[PDB]
Design a protein around this ligand. Structure first.
Ligand code: 7GB
Length: 271
């Protein structure tokens, strides 16, 4: 309506239903838009984000649309805190979901979770859009058990204290390739590296990568050319896929298109 750009939601159209707790970079609620449509509403605390830059990027993020990407519906920026309005993912954080032993997951389910994320990332790669902080902690799960990628690109707008507070370190060392840790060289291939770590997290039912090491120790380990090793639930073929993401040379790592092909091949063999 009058006063709103295509990227802007009128917060008066929101009904708040449940508090979902403190999420990445803000408090999150479940509600409805215009009475009928489920949404999540992420409230961005004053001082936590480069807001004008974020708002400009939200216009681009609105046009990203894929079944395995948490949809950004719009933002509410005429008040503080600003709101991010998104697809609602009823079953919450992937890491919490993996860690609930009651689910008694089959490996076919764990592979499907990998495939969901791979499809989302193949889409982003096709749009030359880097995630920049891919990890199980920002994948969500819907009421149908579908995993979707969230918080894509958002780390670019987080000011230092909020990032540290929400992630638990200045930086996602455990999901970073050598060229990032050494030289800050981000690329599609740093997203590939992170994807392999995420596959490891899925097949390890939500263990912390390098679980006995500090971040400092992890960076040294990766510097020495050493790697995560095989989760017990991963077959040799699955381990080969995740391990391919960790080549010391970025140009020797696969693309998301190749990963998807590899994952489908294992699904067909392990059917
Ligand atoms: C677990 C992975 C995250 C977490 O901290 N949770 C507590 C609240 C609950 N939760 C959400 O955080 N989100 C969610 C994530 C991201 C956004 O914003 C956004 C999406 C896409 C691109 C950029 C920014 C909004 C909300 C939830 C959603 N969507 N539904 C259900 N619970 C959510 C998990």
């Amino acid at each position: 309506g009058l006063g709103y750009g295509s990227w802007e939601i009128d917060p008066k159209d929101l009904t708040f239903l449940k508090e979902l707790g403190t999420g990445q970079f803000g408090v999150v609620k479940y509600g409805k838009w215009r009475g009928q449509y489920d949404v999540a509403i992420k409230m961005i605390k004053e001082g936590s984000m480069s807001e004008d830059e974020f708002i400009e990027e939200a216009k681009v993020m609105m046009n990203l649309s894929h079944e395995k990407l948490v949809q950004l519906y719009g933002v509410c920026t005429k008040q503080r805190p600003i709101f991010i309005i998104t697809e609602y993912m009823a079953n919450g954080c992937l890491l919490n979901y993996l860690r609930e032993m009651r689910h008694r997951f089959q490996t076919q389910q764990l592979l499907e979770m990998c495939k969901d994320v791979c499809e989302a990332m193949e889409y982003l790669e096709s749009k030359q859009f880097l995630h920049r902080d891919l990890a199980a902690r920002n994948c969500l799960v819907n009421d149908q058990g579908v995993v979707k990628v969230s918080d894509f690109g958002l780390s670019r707008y987080v000011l230092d204290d909020e990032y540290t507070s929400s992630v638990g370190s200045k930086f996602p060392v455990r999901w970073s390739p050598p060229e990032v840790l050494m030289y800050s060289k981000f690329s599609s291939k740093s997203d590939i590296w992170a994807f392999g770590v995420l596959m490891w997290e899925i097949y390890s039912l939500g263990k912390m990568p390098y679980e006995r090491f500090t971040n400092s120790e992890t960076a040294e380990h990766i510097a020495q050319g050493l790697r995560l090793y095989r989760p017990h639930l991963a077959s040799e073929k699955v381990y080969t896929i995740m391990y391919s993401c960790w080549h010391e040379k970025a140009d020797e790592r696969p693309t998301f298109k190749i990963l998807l092909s590899n994952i489908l091949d294992v699904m067909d063999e392990e059917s």
